[PDB]
Each structure stands twice: as structure tokens, then as C-alpha cells.
Amino acid sequence: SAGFVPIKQKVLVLSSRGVTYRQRHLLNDLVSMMPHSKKDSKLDSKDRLYQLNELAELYNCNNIFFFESRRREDLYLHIARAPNGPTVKFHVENLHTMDELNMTGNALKGSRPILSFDKTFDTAPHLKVVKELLQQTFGIPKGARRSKPFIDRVCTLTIADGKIWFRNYEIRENVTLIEIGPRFVMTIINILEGSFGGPVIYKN
Amino acid sequence: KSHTICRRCGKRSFHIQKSTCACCGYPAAKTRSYNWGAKAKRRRTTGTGRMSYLKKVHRSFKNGFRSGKPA
Amino acid sequence: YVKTWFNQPGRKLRRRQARQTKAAKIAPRPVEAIRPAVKPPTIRYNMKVRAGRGFTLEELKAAGVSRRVASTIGIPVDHRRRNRSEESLQRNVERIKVYLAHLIVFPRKAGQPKKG
Amino acid sequence: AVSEKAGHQTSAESWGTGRALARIPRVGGGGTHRSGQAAFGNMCRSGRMFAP
Amino acid sequence: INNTVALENIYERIKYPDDISFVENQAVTTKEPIIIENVEDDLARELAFYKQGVSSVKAAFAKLREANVLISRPHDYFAEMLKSDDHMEKVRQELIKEATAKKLSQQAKKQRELK
Amino acid sequence: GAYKYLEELAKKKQSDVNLFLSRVRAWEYRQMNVIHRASRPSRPDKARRLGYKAKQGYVIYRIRVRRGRSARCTAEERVGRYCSNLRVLNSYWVNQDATYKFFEVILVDPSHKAIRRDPRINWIVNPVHKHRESRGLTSIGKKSRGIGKGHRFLRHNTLSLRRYR
Amino acid sequence: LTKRQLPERPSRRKGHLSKRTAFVRSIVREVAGFAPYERRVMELIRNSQDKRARKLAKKRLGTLKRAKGKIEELTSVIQSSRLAH
Amino acid sequence: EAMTLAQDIASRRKSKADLIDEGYNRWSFQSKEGLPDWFLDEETTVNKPNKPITKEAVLALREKMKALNARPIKKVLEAQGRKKMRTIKRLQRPTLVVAKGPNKGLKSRPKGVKGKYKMVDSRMKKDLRAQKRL
Amino acid sequence: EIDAGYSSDSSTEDVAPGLYNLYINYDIDGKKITRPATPAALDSLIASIDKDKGWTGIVDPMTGKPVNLTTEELGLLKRLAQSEIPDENFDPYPDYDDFFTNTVRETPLSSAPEPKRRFAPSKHEQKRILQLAYAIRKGRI
Amino acid sequence: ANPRQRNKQRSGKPRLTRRNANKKAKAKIYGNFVIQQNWDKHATLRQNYARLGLLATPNYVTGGVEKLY
Amino acid sequence: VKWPEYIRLQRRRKILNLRLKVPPAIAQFQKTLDKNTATQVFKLLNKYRPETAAEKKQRLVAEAEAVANGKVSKKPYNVKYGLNHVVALIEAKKAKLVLIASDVDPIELVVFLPALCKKMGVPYAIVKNKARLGTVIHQKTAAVLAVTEVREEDKNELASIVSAVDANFSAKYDESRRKWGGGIMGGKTQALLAKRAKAAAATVRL
RNA sequence: UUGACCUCAAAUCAGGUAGGACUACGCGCUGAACAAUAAGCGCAGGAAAAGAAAAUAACCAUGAUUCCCUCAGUAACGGUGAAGCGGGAAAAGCUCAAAUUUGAAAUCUGGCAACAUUUCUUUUGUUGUCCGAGUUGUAAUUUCAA
RNA sequence: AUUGGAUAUGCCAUAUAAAGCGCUUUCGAAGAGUCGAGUUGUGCAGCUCUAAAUGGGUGGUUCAUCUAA
Numbered sequence A: 001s002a003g004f005v006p007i008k009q010k011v012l013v014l015s016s017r018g019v020t021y022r023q024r025h026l027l028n029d030l031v032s033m034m035p036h037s038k039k040d041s042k043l044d045s046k047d048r049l050y051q052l053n054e055l056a057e058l059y060n061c062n063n064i065f066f067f068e069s070r071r072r073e074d075l076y077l078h079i080a081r082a083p084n085g086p087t088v089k090f091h092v093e094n095l096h097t098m099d100e101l102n103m104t105g106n107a108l109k110g111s112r113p114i115l116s117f118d119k120t121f122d123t124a125p126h127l128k129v130v131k132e133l134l135q136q137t138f139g140i141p142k143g144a145r146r147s148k149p150f151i152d153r154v155c156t157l158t159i160a161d162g163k164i165w166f167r168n169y170e171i172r173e174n175v176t177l178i179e180i181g182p183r184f185v186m187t188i189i190n191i192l193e194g195s196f197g198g199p200v201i202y203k204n
Numbered sequence B: 001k002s003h004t005i006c007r008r009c010g011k012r013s014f015h016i017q018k019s020t021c022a023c024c025g026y027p028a029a030k031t032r033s034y035n036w037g038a039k040a041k042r043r044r045t046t047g048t049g050r051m052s053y054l055k056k057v058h059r060s061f062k063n064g065f066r067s068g069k070p071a
Numbered sequence C: 001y002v003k004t005w006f007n008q009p010g011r012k013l014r015r016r017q018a019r020q021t022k023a024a025k026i027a028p029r030p031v032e033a034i035r036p037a038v039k040p041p042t043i044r045y046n047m048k049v050r051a052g053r054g055f056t057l058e059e060l061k062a063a064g065v066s067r068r069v070a071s072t073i074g075i076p077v078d079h080r081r082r083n084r085s086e087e088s089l090q091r092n093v094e095r096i097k098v099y100l101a102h103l104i105v106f107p108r109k110a111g112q113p114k115k116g
Numbered sequence D: 001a002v003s004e005k006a007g008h009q010t011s012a013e014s015w016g017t018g019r020a021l022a023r024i025p026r027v028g029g030g031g032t033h034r035s036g037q038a039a040f041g042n043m044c045r046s047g048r049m050f051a052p
Numbered sequence E: 001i002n003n004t005v006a007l008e009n010i011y012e013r014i015k016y017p018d019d020i021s022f023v024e025n026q027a028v029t030t031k032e033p034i035i036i037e038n039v040e041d042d043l044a045r046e047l048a049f050y051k052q053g054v055s056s057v058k059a060a061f062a063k064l065r066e067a068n069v070l071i072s073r074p075h076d077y078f079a080e081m082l083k084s085d086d087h088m089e090k091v092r093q094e095l096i097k098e099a100t101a102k103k104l105s106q107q108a109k110k111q112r113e114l115k
Numbered sequence F: 001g002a003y004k005y006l007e008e009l010a011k012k013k014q015s016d017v018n019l020f021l022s023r024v025r026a027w028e029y030r031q032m033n034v035i036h037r038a039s040r041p042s043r044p045d046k047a048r049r050l051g052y053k054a055k056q057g058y059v060i061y062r063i064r065v066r067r068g069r070s071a072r073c074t075a076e077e078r079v080g081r082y083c084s085n086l087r088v089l090n091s092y093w094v095n096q097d098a099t100y101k102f103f104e105v106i107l108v109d110p111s112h113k114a115i116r117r118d119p120r121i122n123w124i125v126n127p128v129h130k131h132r133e134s135r136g137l138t139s140i141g142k143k144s145r146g147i148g149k150g151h152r153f154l155r156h157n158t159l160s161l162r163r164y165r
Numbered sequence G: 001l002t003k004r005q006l007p008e009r010p011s012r013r014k015g016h017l018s019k020r021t022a023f024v025r026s027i028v029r030e031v032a033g034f035a036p037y038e039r040r041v042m043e044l045i046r047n048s049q050d051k052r053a054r055k056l057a058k059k060r061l062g063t064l065k066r067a068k069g070k071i072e073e074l075t076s077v078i079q080s081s082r083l084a085h
Numbered sequence H: 001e002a003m004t005l006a007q008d009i010a011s012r013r014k015s016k017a018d019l020i021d022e023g024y025n026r027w028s029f030q031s032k033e034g035l036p037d038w039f040l041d042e043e044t045t046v047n048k049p050n051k052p053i054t055k056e057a058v059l060a061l062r063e064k065m066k067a068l069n070a071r072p073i074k075k076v077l078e079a080q081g082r083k084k085m086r087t088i089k090r091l092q093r094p095t096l097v098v099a100k101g102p103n104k105g106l107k108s109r110p111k112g113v114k115g116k117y118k119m120v121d122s123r124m125k126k127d128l129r130a131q132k133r134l
Numbered sequence I: 001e002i003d004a005g006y007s008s009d010s011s012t013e014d015v016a017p018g019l020y021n022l023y024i025n026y027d028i029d030g031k032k033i034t035r036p037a038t039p040a041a042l043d044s045l046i047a048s049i050d051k052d053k054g055w056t057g058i059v060d061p062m063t064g065k066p067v068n069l070t071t072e073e074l075g076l077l078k079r080l081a082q083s084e085i086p087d088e089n090f091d092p093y094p095d096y097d098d099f100f101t102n103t104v105r106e107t108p109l110s111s112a113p114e115p116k117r118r119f120a121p122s123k124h125e126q127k128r129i130l131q132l133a134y135a136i137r138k139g140r141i
Numbered sequence J: 001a002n003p004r005q006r007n008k009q010r011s012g013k014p015r016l017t018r019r020n021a022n023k024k025a026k027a028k029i030y031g032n033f034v035i036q037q038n039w040d041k042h043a044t045l046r047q048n049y050a051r052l053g054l055l056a057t058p059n060y061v062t063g064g065v066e067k068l069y
Numbered sequence K: 001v002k003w004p005e006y007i008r009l010q011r012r013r014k015i016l017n018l019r020l021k022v023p024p025a026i027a028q029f030q031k032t033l034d035k036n037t038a039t040q041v042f043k044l045l046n047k048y049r050p051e052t053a054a055e056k057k058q059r060l061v062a063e064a065e066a067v068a069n070g071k072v073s074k075k076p077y078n079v080k081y082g083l084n085h086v087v088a089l090i091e092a093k094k095a096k097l098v099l100i101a102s103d104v105d106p107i108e109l110v111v112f113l114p115a116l117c118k119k120m121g122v123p124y125a126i127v128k129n130k131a132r133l134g135t136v137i138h139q140k141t142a143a144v145l146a147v148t149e150v151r152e153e154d155k156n157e158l159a160s161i162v163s164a165v166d167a168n169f170s171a172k173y174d175e176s177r178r179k180w181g182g183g184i185m186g187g188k189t190q191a192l193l194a195k196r197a198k199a200a201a202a203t204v205r206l
Numbered sequence L: 001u002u003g004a005c006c007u008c009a010a011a012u013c014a015g016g017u018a019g020g021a022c023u024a025c026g027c028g029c030u031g032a033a034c035a036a037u038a039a040g041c042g043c044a045g046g047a048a049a050a051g052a053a054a055a056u057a058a059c060c061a062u063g064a065u066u067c068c069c070u071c072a073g074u075a076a077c078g079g080u081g082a083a084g085c086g087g088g089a090a091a092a093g094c095u096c097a098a099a100u101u102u103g104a105a106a107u108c109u110g111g112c113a114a115c116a117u118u119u120c121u122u123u124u125g126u127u128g129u130c131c132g133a134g135u136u137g138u139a140a141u142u143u144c145a146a
Numbered sequence M: 001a002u003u004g005g006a007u008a009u010g011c012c013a014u015a016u017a018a019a020g021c022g023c024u025u026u027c028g029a030a031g032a033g034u035c036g037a038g039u040u041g042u043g044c045a046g047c048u049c050u051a052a053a054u055g056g057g058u059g060g061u062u063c064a065u066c067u068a069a
Ligand SMILES: [Zn+2]
Pocket: B006, B007, B008, B009, B010, B011, B013, B014, B021, B022, B023, B024, B025, B026
């Protein structure tokens, strides 16, 4: 059929050829972070990205994640709504992995987090759309497989000089939060009105 | 005795039990050569003998390896 | 491992002899072929003009030379290079056309049987 | 220049400490006038010159 | 080009209903618009981020308290975690070395005055 | 020409025809020796395009090498040693099973007059082509050592001191 | 400068499908038969399990475009056979 | 090999539907129905696909192969005892020389010296005192 | 849209049993699942002393009891381990399917025009005839 | 120095000496007869080509040419 | 009895090709043209043998003498041979009758020819041995022969041979060539295999 | 019965060829302790290897390989460490597979026989003839620059 | 003496031949257990799976360039 036990949100994750060791570290850290994401092999075409809708329909995932490495020194992340929907391209800088010595946060894999967005996400329209889209993606829907029922971590999204800061924290009993480890500086580049297509509706 | 005369290199290094010379490696077809033995090579290399044919080739090259008889 | 240049004078004279040995073989003709004029591929160097490898198949055809006799009279051919602008084409056509006007081509000996 | 392998061609190692002889390497083997003679040194006869 | 009308239409089309319970969404928007002007001073922004997270955690806990959802994780929970247990041993060793370095520095400082 | 049909027929290596023949020939090649003479190539299409002409002086030798260095490179080196009076021109893949990979090696006799008088294979009679397989100069030997044009594929540690420095 | 439009080089003509190569490939495709995974894929397409067929072909070949080309090739075999069967 | 496969079906790690699809390969279509013994015997010896092997199946097979009387009271006590007593029977189973007079300028083991030994020449005393001061 | 559902055969699913501590701890919504009582020592000894057919020795996380493959599962394992078609009724030997050659092509495959070689006396023979003519007049033949 | 080299140092057979080491000799001209007659062996090829009215290279020269006057 | 290794290989390959399941494209070569029609085929083919190497040189030197003294002919008619030449003739739709050898050693050289011949509309037949075809063309072997043109005398003869091949090879078999070949077993082989199969299926499943 | 072919053997069968040495430079493989290193193994030449773009670049574009200078201790990677451009040395381009010669296997090795030829009675061919190789494909033609 | 590439000249030449350029109301084949995907080792190799035909490779912001086995 179209779907058995339809979970509200599912994610599809891909990586392009020529990704770096740290970039592959971040991608592996993410797929562990959201358990409702289906990993997929490399995409051979760094240019014909519009096929991702067909991949999304195949795997029944409505949220597309693509980690494109350019020149083996730039990291970009395309996040889109699989059926029609917006497509937002981000640029990644100042990466941080799980294996870093400084970051000692420890969370349960699949535990449903709490999303805390900076109020600046409600100022501009494109920021409103991005906040809502990121909410529907990072927020693990109820009944997701391999997910944990307990609440243990909080993911924080903040806007600083037009740059999104994403920080995950582990709540300790008493908040006394501890940085989990995923720390990277985000940069919105452009937004497409369609799934990897359509006219550009926002430009940096 | 533990060594006898090797027929190939004429040295009393042919092991009786293993039937193998310790100097050249007889009866192996290839001679025993080891680059860590730099002095070992210069003791038995080319030129340490008559070198009768090589001297003939060296002498015959200048005229173009010709044959026949003069006028 | 240290590389030394004590044979730098020895190398310079050996090449001058090699040029002299070429001229002994082929005396009425230059010891170098005629290279075209091209513009280097960068924003730093595109103002300059240096010598390329050979004349494109369109530069030969426009000048009047065919790609078969070009090598015979000493004109190198570059099948890879192409003419993206009329400036490069007209520049190298005149380089060949000057060459053809300054060239003396000695006739060969043609075999011809008794009948046709 | 001197030969790069001049003075290195012998097979000498220090005879050890505590034998009432200078610890300069001495050529091993036996049965010749050379065995027991010190080598591998600027001060030694038939030894490498200092800073070739 | 930054079409607010188009963005608003897309936002309305993909808007999550407000009637959705906080349990289903688990997304909290801070009422206080926390602003960190000192972008260069990351230490100052860290306190602001912690305060925003603490406020969000308190709001979520109060909202989820009426939902009868176990916020606390029992000590008997031994499921698979995001951070590998093998990696935790290396993390503990690194923290132990850093703690020992601070202890040695304090001991040396006390020894300097003692001598 | 039939060589087009053979080329496109050898592309589908698990179809009904190509799977039936693969097993039948694999058992047959196992009955014979590890390195045995092949009277004619089993793939006339592939040998043809690798340099083989059906004239005197061209030799085909079939060899199987255990799976689990490149197997093709091993095939040429073992055959070239076995037939030491010939030159290893090229080689190709013919069959395989769970234990063995079967190859056919095209060799050329450099003392044959049909080879020494052929202007298109004269190049192999010169002594610089002695044991191309041994020096990594064959098609698979070139690949195994990264020889190629592009970015994918002693000047470093030497100190070059000029006269006037 | 005055831009010149250039002709097409013969090396850029490569990839063009010929009438004889199309005929040869279709003749050989029928004669040879189908690979074990192709036989399974055609069963799934006949049983209308299109989603399972595409996932299988992508798993076998290793790329979605290769899978999409193979599924189109095999489904054209199915319809052409069903027209003649 | 079968145990690694049997573990995968039961443990649900590998989906049953995917296992069935993975069973349509180059080797399953090489049918063995009716072939002669002289052909099959070499085919199994040679043309046998080598599937991957997991340590868990190795342990499980060892558990199956563990007979009821594999390790009874005697084979766990006297068999342990014979090894222990064997090991017990296996278990029960420097001189200062001064470089002077005839000992001066030696290169190997000197006369009338056996076992571990050390050589002293009274010149290393200066180095010894310096080392002590270090 | 696509409903963001789950197919019945998706490679990701709940419950990942492992080699036979008991993982009877919790469930969804954070409620403690009752731990099933340990089986009778007599029954456990019987199972340990006599392995059931297809004894995998794998325990699901929910219950401490082992999981054993059923008759059909043993049948599929037998087919898979012996390398045969895992479907009992699926003809691996279908009839010949002439989906392309069942219709006759009315035109020649190539469109290249005929050369004049084929309508005039051959040049290779004429070349050899001239060569043989030269040999005759020179007395060689 | 070598055992091969000391072999002929002590040998009585004279060395295979060939006296071909005449530097500063510029190759004589075959090919064209007219060039050979008007070519003088002291001058370089660049000086001979210029004197005869020919071009040694149709390209630029990668150095400073000579200036005698 | 101890057979040599190559004799054992020969006979095992004969039996192995029988017990296995031969694909329809390879099993159609097991069913060749009948003995009577093959005789009539080769009667026509032996009126169009290519002229011998001696007979060709004999003709050429005859014309060479004429020009050597002082000095227009007809198009030669014969049988067409050579795999690439014949395949090119079939695709050109010029061949009137294609005769495929039944034992070409790498079988895929001719495995597509029955399909290619049926695709292009060419009457074809599979005849016994590569040596009979070779004998016609003065060779040791011909993987395939073909007839494109015959003299007006033999136009009626070829039309009879083509009809006989159509009636005795194409109208016949036909469904028999669409079936997988092989699996043939001896008189006592199934009984022995049935005992082996039931014994194996009992408890020898490991 | 007689004979075609396929495969496989045999011969102190006719004529050939391989091995070992040297190993400075060259090309592969293998490889440590402290370095695409030493040692070990395989294989050549007077040079070897590389080589006529599945190459760069983002320009007004360049145009096989090799080497030199430079780029440059630069970018990148985290101390290591390039390459494109640029200046120069030398320059040279090409051969196949995939096409029906089909109005003609036009191709080739060997034997025998004459005839020449020679660094040479020592070398190298030619012409004739016969047996063979070859249609499961040897020549001419074409190689994308077309 | 022994040779090299030219020049002059004699004899022979199988030209019913061969080629360049230019024109097209006619055609134009292009290398597979290879590329690639997955994984394990040190671009390369093993293992498992295994292709395409304006296709495929490599770059860059649709474009450029190239045409492997
Ligand atoms: Zn010896």
C-alpha cells in the first residue's frame, strides 16, 4: 500500500562524492541523532538533484537531507520538503563531532528532544518558514521507530548576525545543561519554492 | 669436516650436509649475491678473472664487429 | 642526496653542438619550426602573447595550406587548439602568410613511368 | 673531495667499557696485523678524516 | 526576491496546527527575545544560550507535567545511547588528565609559597 | 559483422546463455591444467580488439588464478614465465567461479618471420619489450601502478645546489 | 573581441545511438536471456510491486539512475512480450 | 554459514523479504537437480559461494556440538589436575673481573670466568662518581 | 504528497534481538513492562538438554524466552544455505520469449549506398592480372 | 680502482684508446651544396645563417643577441 | 579400465551437456536439418563452390597472357562464406538461404544467427558438422554459409530447397526450439537419482 | 565400410628461442627497526620509464611526454607539502578493434629451386614453385583531428 | 679502407594504378566482471553486487572540457 503505520515525519539522508572525514563524521552523528531518517548511498549526480523526489517517494520520506561537499573544502546542506515544499540551502562552517574531547554530553539515542528556537526566527517570513521546516524535521514524531520515550536533551537554535547557531544540550537532574557535541555555524544561502526546483524566492 | 670444495667457485665452502656452497650458492643456477656484502661482491665480481671473451668483445667493437679478411 | 651543477657549462656547450649538428643535417632550412601566437589562459597573463604549439586546422585552411603539406614545409599543426575569436584567427593567418612569402621550396624528383 | 666511503670500509665496533683500552672502535677478526687496531676516527690511522 | 507574500503563503500551507499538544511537537518558542549583541564574546553568549535553554526546559517541563509523561529517566534504563560507552572511557580519561593538571598547578603554587 | 553481436553478447554475463556457458566452460577449464594452451580464443571479439590477429606467431594461453595484487596481473606474469620465448601482448577475462578466475593471455613470438616482417607488430621484437609483464608495462600493469593522465594519478628530497648560489 | 561560434567536434558525437547498434542490442538482449536479478525484477513488476522492484534494482546496480534505466528497460520487455503473448 | 543465516532470520536484523530477493543470484540459478556425482563432487568443492561468517554463529555451533558428557566431573577435575601437575613438574625441572694483568685488553669471555660477568678497569670509576652525582 | 508512511518491508523496524541481560525495562510512553516469569527449571533443562529443531539461540528483548524458527523458516534457510531458488513455484526455465524477432524487418539494416566496386570488374584481379602480365613478358612465369 | 679496472692496469695489453675528444669543432655541412660552399667553419650557425641571408629560427630568440659594432 | 585424461574429458562433456538444462538459444542447435534435405541442400551448394586457389590462378594467368600479347566478363556466381561477411549479408537482406554449422566451438559465434535470420526474414537451416560446410568452400571449416544469387538455371532448384527447409526445419521444430533443452537421463538414471534424492531429502540436509 | 573435421598426444622430427653475469642510472614487487628508505625478489636499455588528453582551466583561453627555473615553503592537510598559470630545453606524430574485398584471401610462414646481395663465402633479400596457415577473418580502407 | 644522406646521369617502372584539396537531395561503426555502488585493506588491490548510449569521465556556477576500460 501507500504506507503501513504512517509516521507523521520521515527523513531521507544522502551524501555526495568527495565528502571529508569530518563531514562524514557529522553525517553519521546526525543519522544517529534523528532515528526517523533513512540513510541512502552516494548520489552520483551533483547536478541532477531533482531526482530526490523520486527517492523520497520510494522510501516514504517527506524530508530530504543532502550533504554536498564542494572542492573538498566546502560543506553545504540542502533541506527540503519532499512533495513540492520549500528547499533551503545552508552553508556549514566550524564543525564539531561526537569524538571531540571537550564535548562530554551523553544522551539516549532516539530520545525525543525539546526544540528551543530564538524568537528572532519569528521576525522575517523566510525565517518563519525555515523555523517551521526545521521544527518538523528535528522534532521526532510520536511513535517513531528506535525512538526513546524519555525526554533527555534540548536542541537550541539561535540567530546571530543572520547566522543560525545549532547547539544540543543534555539536561541533568537537580537545569545544568551539558553540550552534547553537535556544534556548527549555519548560513542560509537561498530558498527555492519547490523541491530542488522552481523560482528562487529568497536570496542572501 | 663440515665443508668441502665447491665445484663452481672452487672454495672450500660446500656444506656436506646441506649440499650447498656458502660462497656462491651452488647448485643453484643463480650466484649468491647480497648488497649488504659490498666487499663480498668486489672479491669475486667481473674482472677478478681472465675475462678473456669480454676483452675480445671490447676489442672488436671499434671496427664495427666486422669479419672477413683484408685485401 | 645533493644535486650539483658542475656540468652546467658542459651541458650548454653540448646543446650548442646539437644545434650545430642539426644544421649540418638540414642546412638551407631553419633549426626550429614556426610556432603560432597565442594568449595565456589566466586573468594575470591574457594581455601577453607567447608562442603556442601549432596552427589550428582553421588557421591552416584560411591561410591556404592543407593539413597534409603543412608538416612537410615545416608548419606544426595543433588539432586540439581552436579559434574562439576572430582576433586569434587573423593573427595566426598572417603569421603563416608571412612564412609562406619568406619561404623557398626546393622541387623534388617525381617518378613518372614510360606510359600513363 | 675525498671518497664518501673512505674510512668506513672496515668492520669495527667498540670493544666495550672496562677493558683498560680506549673505547675507540677496533677492527675484529684475527690473524693479520690489522686485527685489534682502532678505526673509525679522525685521530686513528686509516680512519675517516674529520668533516670530509 | 525576498517575497514576503510568497513566504507567508508557504508558511501557512506548511503551518503546524496550534492545537497540537506540546507532547506531539516538543518544540518551544521562547517568549523572551534573547539577544546577544556581543557576537565576538562567545563566553557572554554561552550564558544567554544556557538561560534560554533553562527557560525553555522549565516551560516544557511545566507543560509536560500535566501530560503525565515521565520527564526523568530511571536509573534502570540501559538502552542504546547516542554517545558510545567506549568513547566515554576516552572522554573520562581526558577529563581526568585535565583535572589532574589543575590539581598539580594548585599544588605547585602552594609549594612555591611553602618553600 | 559478427564481432558487434559478440561484444554486446559478452556484456550480459549472467543471462541464460552466458550463465550456462560460464559453468560448462569453467568445469572444462578445471579438468585441464592450470596453464594450458588454447587452440583458439574463447572470445574472438575480445582478443581481436586487444591486438590478436589470427595468424602465425600469435599465441593464446588460458590460466586460472585463485581469488580471495590483481589477479589479471598475476595471470600474465605466470604465463610469461611459463612461455619464456614469447612476449606478453595483452590479456582478458574469460570466466570465473567461486574459487578461480580464468584468463586468456595473448602472446607473440618475436622470432617468427610473420611477426618480424609485420610493421604493426615489429615493435615487440625490439629488446626493450623484454618481459613487459614483469616491468608493469602491460595494460593491467600500467593501471596497477597508477600510470595515467590527470590529477587522479626523487625531485622532492634532493637538494639542488647551483654553481652561482 | 568578436566571438566566433565553433562547429561540433567528432569526439563530442560519441554517445549517439546508432540504428545498427540499437538493432544489435535488441537482438542480443532477447537471445541471451535475462540475469537472475532481472528475472526477479520482472516478477515484481508483473505482480505490480513497483516499489519493491525499484528498491531491488537500485540495491543490485548501486545507483538510482541505473535502477530507473533498468526498470524502464525491463518493463518495456514485459509490455512488448505481453503484446506478443 | 547456515547458522549466521539462521541467526539473521530469527534476530530480524536482516529482513526476510530482502533475504529472499538476495537469494536470486548467479549461483542459485546454477541448478544441481539431476547432475552426475562426478560433476557435483567437484562443483561443491570448487564452485561453492563463500558467505560471510559471524562469531556469534561460531559460539552457537560450539554450544550445539557441546556433548552432554563433554565436560563431566572427571573430565573437569582430573583433566585439569593432570595439566596442573604437569606444569608443576615443568616448574621444578654477576662475577666482577678487573681488567689487569692477563685480563687487560680482552675482547670476549676471559680465562677462568663463567656465567654472568662484568668488567672494570678503574677508569670507569670517574664515570661512576659522575653518574652518582647526576 | 507521500503520506510519510512506512512500507511493510522497510529495512528499519523496531525490536532488534541479539545473541542469547534481560531488556525488560520499559516501553513507549515510559511505562515499565511486566517482566515475564522465568520458565520452570525442568522446562529450561529440557530445552537446554534437547535443542529444538532450528534452535537459533536468540532471545527477543521483550521476553527472556528464546526465539526458534518455524517449519517454513527452516525451509527457507535450507533453500538459502543450499543455494537454490528461494521460491518453490517460480520457473527458472521459462520458454523462449521472442519479444523482438516475432516481427519481420522489411528493410536492410544499413542505409549506406552501394559502392561501384560491386557493379564493375574487380580491381584486385585486374591489379594481379597486370602483375602477372609483367611477369610473363619478363620471362619469370 | 675496481677489480675490473685493476685487471687491465696490471695487464700488458694496451688500452683501447680512441682520440675523438676534439671539442670546439663545429659540424661540417652536408645536405645542400650551395650552403656548403658559402659556409665558413669558424662562425656559429646563427652567424652563418645571418650572413647567408637565412633565418636560423622563424621565432623570437630567447636571449640577448650579439652586438659587435 | 583407465581412460586417458583427455578421453575422459571428452565423454564427460558429452554427458554433462545432456544432463544440464541447455537454454533455448543453445538447445536449438541440437535439432538439425534432416538427412534427405541436407543432401539436396549440398547438391545445389556444390554447383556454386568458390573456385580453387589453383583454378583462380589458372584463370588469371590466362587473361594475363592475352594482355601480354594484346587486347567484358560476367559477374561470378558462388556461395558466400565467412561469419562477418554472411552476417553483413543477412542484415542487408541479400541472403536467400543461410546454413549454420551445428557445432561451432565457441557457440556464441552462431547463437544469434537463428534469431538474426528470423528477424530479417531469411530462410535458414542448421546442418551437421562445420566440416561439411568447410568442404564446400575448400576450407577445413565454415561456421556459416549463405546463398545470395544463383544462375537462372537453378532459380527453380533453390525455390524447392527453400520450401523444403521451410517445411522440414522451420515449420517443424519451431515450438521445439522455444523449449529449454537437456535434462535427458538414461533408462536407469532416474531410478538411481530418485533413490539418491529421497535419501538426501530424508536427513542429509545440513 | 571409407573419409572429413575437432580436440589431444608423440618424435635425438625441420628451424628457432628462453635461462646465467653486470646492475651506476631505469621499471616493477616487497619492506623494517629507527621511510614509497635500507635489505630481499623480478625485469630491461643505451638510456629506461612517460607520452599524442576520459588534460587543464573559468581566461582575449591554453594544448602529448620529459627535464629545468618559477610558482612556493605557497594552497591544502594538520610539521608535512603540491599543482594550474608563467620563463626555458627539445619537439613528431601516430597504429589498431568496432565497416561486405564479396565483381573473386586481394594476405602470410615454410620446403625446394634458381638469382642476386654483403662490414661478411659469415649478411640480407628477390623471383619461381609446391605444401600449409587463414573465412571462428589474413590484406587494402578508416581511427573521431575524423 | 668501411660507410651516410643528397646531387648529376644511365637503365628499369606491374599507371586499367595511387593521393591531396574542393563539393554533397547519401552514410558515419568508437574497446564490460569494465565503469560504478557497497565494504575491507594499503589513487591502487581484494571480496559482494554489477551498468549506460548525447552515454560516460572530470571540472565549475544549466555550463565548460575531455572521450577511459
Ligand atoms: Zn661455491
